[PDB]
Ligand binder design. Sequence first.
Ligand SMILES: CCCCCCCCCCCCCCCCCC(=O)OC[C@H](COP(=O)(O)OCCN)OC(=O)CCCCCCCCCCCCCCCCC
Ligand SMILES: [Zn+2]
Lengths: 120, 174, 331, 63, 99, 459, 64, 57, 19
Amino acid sequence: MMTGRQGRATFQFLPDEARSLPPPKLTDPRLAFVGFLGYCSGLIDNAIRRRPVLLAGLHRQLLYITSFVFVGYYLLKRQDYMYAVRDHDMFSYIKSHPEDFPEKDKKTYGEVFEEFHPVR
Amino acid sequence: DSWDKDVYPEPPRRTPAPSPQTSLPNPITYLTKAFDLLVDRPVTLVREFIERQHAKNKYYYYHREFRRVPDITECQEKDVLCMFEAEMQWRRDYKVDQEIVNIIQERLKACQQREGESHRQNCAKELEQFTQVVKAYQDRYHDLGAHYSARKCLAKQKQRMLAERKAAKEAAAA
Amino acid sequence: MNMFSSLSLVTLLLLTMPIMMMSFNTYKPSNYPLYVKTAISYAFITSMIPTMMFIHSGQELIISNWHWLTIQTLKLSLSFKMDYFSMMFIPVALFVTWSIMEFSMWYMYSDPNINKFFKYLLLFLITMLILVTANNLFQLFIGWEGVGIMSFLLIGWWYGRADANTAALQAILYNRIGDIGFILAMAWFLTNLNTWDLQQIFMLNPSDSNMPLIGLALAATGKSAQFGLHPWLPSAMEGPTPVSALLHSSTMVVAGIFLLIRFYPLTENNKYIQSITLCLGAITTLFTAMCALTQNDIKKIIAFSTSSQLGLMMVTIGINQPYLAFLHICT
Amino acid sequence: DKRFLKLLRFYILLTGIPVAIGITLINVFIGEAELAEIPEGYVPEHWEYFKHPISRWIARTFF
Amino acid sequence: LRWQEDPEPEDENLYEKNPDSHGYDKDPAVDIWNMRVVFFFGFSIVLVLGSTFVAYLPDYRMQEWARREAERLVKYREAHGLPIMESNCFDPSKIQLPE
Amino acid sequence: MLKYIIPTIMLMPLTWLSKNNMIWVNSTAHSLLISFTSLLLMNQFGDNSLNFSLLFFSDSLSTPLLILTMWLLPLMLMASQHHLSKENLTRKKLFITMLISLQLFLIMTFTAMELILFYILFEATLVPTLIIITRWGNQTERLNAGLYFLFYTLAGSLPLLVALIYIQNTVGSLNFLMLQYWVQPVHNSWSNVFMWLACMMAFMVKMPLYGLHLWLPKAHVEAPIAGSMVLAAVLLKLGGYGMLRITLILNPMTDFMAYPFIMLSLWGMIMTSSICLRQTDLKSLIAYSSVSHMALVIVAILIQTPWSYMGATALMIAHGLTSSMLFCLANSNYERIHSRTMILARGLQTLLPLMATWWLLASLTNLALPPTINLIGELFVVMSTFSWSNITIILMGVNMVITALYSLYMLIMTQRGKYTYHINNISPSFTRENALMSLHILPLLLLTLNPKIILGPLY
Amino acid sequence: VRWTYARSANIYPNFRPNTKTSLLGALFGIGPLVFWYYVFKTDRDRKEKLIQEGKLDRTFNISY
Amino acid sequence: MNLLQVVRDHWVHVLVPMGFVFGYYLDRKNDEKLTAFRNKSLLYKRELKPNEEVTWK
Amino acid sequence: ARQWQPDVEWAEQYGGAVM
Ligand SMILES: CCCCCCCCCCCCCCCCCC(=O)OC[C@H](COP(=O)(O)OCCN)OC(=O)CCCCCCCCCCCCCCCCC
Ligand SMILES: [Zn+2]
């Protein structure tokens, strides 16, 4: 639904306006889980090729962890940018059309009548 | 001393004086003397020693007091922050009212045992107070269901108030 | 008061110590049957002290010592009612059990599991005293089902006998049918009187009492082996004779009658129930006595005598003489 | 069967006896607290609203 | 035979080789330590200390407090002639019934 | 809840990284430490639940279920040792990994604050459960039992997924605290009749409801002992816990939509109790016994009274320990005679005096002998249903009679009569077997002293 | 083995839906459910009517 | 007897005990982010004691 | 007894052109 957004940044992984948003922390729990998925890939790689799962090729296991974390960091930046843009458009539209989003008249439960249904 | 006598009233005691009409030795008196000597006395000594240790290390605990907060009637629709505090207060008062019914029930049960065969007359005061509190408890907290809440209690009240308002008006129509 | 209440509770606690010591605290299997018997002997003596006090000044008290559970507006406490009925039945039950246990040491001398047999007999005695001393329905129900389960374990004592297991399971079957009335009574009292305590049950004194009392009458039928649920009591003459002497002839089968006596303040204001209890008892005394005129087994004959006696007790409740029914239990 | 019941008793009493002794000592030489009114301008700790010393310790340490 | 299949093995009774077996393992050293952890952590810790912990919960579900509070209110209201408990949980002044 | 989630996950490294001969010792010891720490969840307040974070919360309803779940894991490891003693080491550790992953999902299910998170974890218990049944089951029928267990749950769950997402769009949140305040009544329309069914049929099939229970005799019989303990003790309670939550947003439509399910439950328990009087398989008799006790819980939840919700919580926890114990007792016999027929080994009280004591206690609590919490929960539901309608006392009472008949019938066929002459390998009960039964019954009988911790939020 | 096998597993493969099995299935499967529905629905409709009118004695009915 | 076959066959016993400490640690961290109403609720709001900066942490 | 595993009869159900 946001394919044709007014932002004239087409086919860009991270439009320059995305640099106004905070980057993910390197200790982000989402980034730790992505790194963990890299570790599982390392162990599964050892098992299918019949190597000591925990010990074999520590050089290859590190590259699995690093590769996943590296790609995960940028997918999180774009993930957070897209949600930031979603809220930006939503609030702008609500401001541009005040008649469609009126402030409801406040009422208190001492004034609002609610039907009572006995449980007996 | 241990408990407040106003909440749990007990009528003043009256013990008939012994008026024996037999020269035989009343065994209960002799057993009473023995019990007060071989049981009551040793127990008191242990309690006195224990009590003294308590006075050496004396410390206090306090009865928590909750300041009143706006109730459900003053909460705006779909305002969780106000509704949350109003609902928690209602649940607390619900527990207090449950124990009040227990206090009155305890007085009613205590009266029945104390008065013996005269309970049906001497306990009319307790029964009337028991009937009043129960009806007050029933009107507020009954038929709400397992998922009861302040909102459901308020709606039941407004239903009862409307019927009372209409019932008085309908009767006054004649 | 202090002596009265303290000596009333020690009677119950004294009977528990032989059970507690079975957890290899003090070990003496050779005299354990004698150990249980001696405890009953002392339990009778201590129970007499409250009994003599009641005879003197008509003293009675309630002891709600422990607060167990509180379901909103229903406070359940471990309450013992030391009154006319409890102060008089406890000495009698202990006095009879005292003789039963001494008899058992001779009758069951050659039984390999005599230690188990005496533990089971004492377990029944504790449950009956809970039943007799109960002040609220839930505690009364613990003893109610307790005596039933101990009856099952003692009726089927010789478990290699297919015909003893049938008698034990038959006793559970019939008593459970009567428990429907007991659960019905508890539900009605909670729904209407908002209580299970006998103090508040009598104080409110409902007039419409056909349903709760019909429940108690049905409960009495199964427990006291009145007509309709009678056949199990003759069948209960399959376990050792000492069981027949204590439970199914003297102390257990009088549970159904004892329940209606405890609720006499309600029955005496309801003539409808008295008619049912009268007729139910009348057929039981006639029918069971009639079945005893041609029996050959000596234990069976006494069993049909007990059912006939229980029918007479139910008749006494049906003529609005609750205290004579109790006096017949003790005698 | 006899070996199991002796093992069960040993491990029930291995910590049961120290707890039984420990509770008795607290009840004797410490005892329960005393209901007292809140001093003017004093805010008790959340664990000072309970009576038994063990309850206060449980509330203070874990809860 | 329809295939080459091993004959069904017979069961092994752990009592035959180790009459002191606790039923946990063939190895006596593992078998004894399997039993000790189960009994110590199962009975000596969870059931005994857990039982004591549950017994001394600091006023579980606030039920003891509600009893003191009820006594305080009952004393206050009986000393001023107010009803013990009213049929309205909320003051009607705040309620605005329809029409 | 991270103080229980993380330790549970660490049981997987502990199992794989431990010595070959210490997998059972180390997993059992540390899973018991986790169970010990779960007692800290009893910091329950009388007005407010114990809300940890945005994801997890624990009120008086979740706490008893959490302690039961974490208490069963060590008991499941004790039970499984015999029949896994002669299996490949890696596959023994995979079996243990399945049990740990099942506890991980359960404790997160009972604490999830958001119903869609509840659904995911509620639905995630299937995978580890199915694998246990089909891989380490003993018979050929285990393969047909997994399919029945799988497509019965999913056939009901997938409609629940649509209903939950529908409620979020309309209400704006599936957070349970939010629903407690934003809940609106359900109007009586054909559209809401099928919202109600979607929200409930998922939880009905897991209880199970009579009629939708054919998967339970298959899954509880063809599964290993460890599978049968979790299946009957906890996994049946995901249905009960679900209904105790989702009925908040279903009033007042539950007043009339509960009639067909109350009749299926009130009449169903007589039907399933009667089936137990003629079952030739001891394990199958225990499975059919679960359907009768869970029928009381369904009635308890659908009438929505404080006494019914207190009974339901006690019934679930009480039946959790009793059902698990009964399966273990039946399994101890099976590990000797290697057959599930009830009438094959008899008079076992002559050869196993102490194991017959456990049989007696297991049966007494099964038939709800007071003051056991089995009776407390059943008694509370009977009182609540009597107020719902006085005639229900007939059906409740009849079930008590039938319940005591099959309970003692099971105790009399296997523990009495004459021993089977040709069975000559009834070795004395091991310490492992005896300790397994104590860890069930002893906590079950202790809760009678302080039963308020298993009476739920409405205590 | 043959006794238990016939009692459990060999029943359905030998089942044929006919007049006898169909009629007995409904009479013993659906009859009791319909019977108890009208016994309870009628009873609760009756009771609910009295409570609204105020003709049902609930003086001390505060436990449910 | 020697760490060569002691600290390698028994190091796994810190895995679960250490997972509890780490879990208990993260539970406290969550409380740091849920302080929007610390000493700001109508029920328990009050004035800070002479020596304190946060009513609870 | 011993855990059941498929025999040739069971496996040949899955060796045909169709199920
Ligand atoms: C095992 C095979 C399967 C067995 C299936 C179950 C048996 C089916 C039996 C056939 C169905 C009979 C039920 C008929 C519908 C109920 C009509 C009735 O008579 O109810 C009586 C009584 C009325 O109470 P209420 O709810 O207020 O309704 C009043 C309506 N005017 O209702 C009540 O208040 C409840 C009274 C309960 C009475 C005790 C339970 C009866 C059984 C007792 C044991 C046997 C002794 C029978 C004699 C005592 C009768 C009380
Ligand atoms: Zn085996």
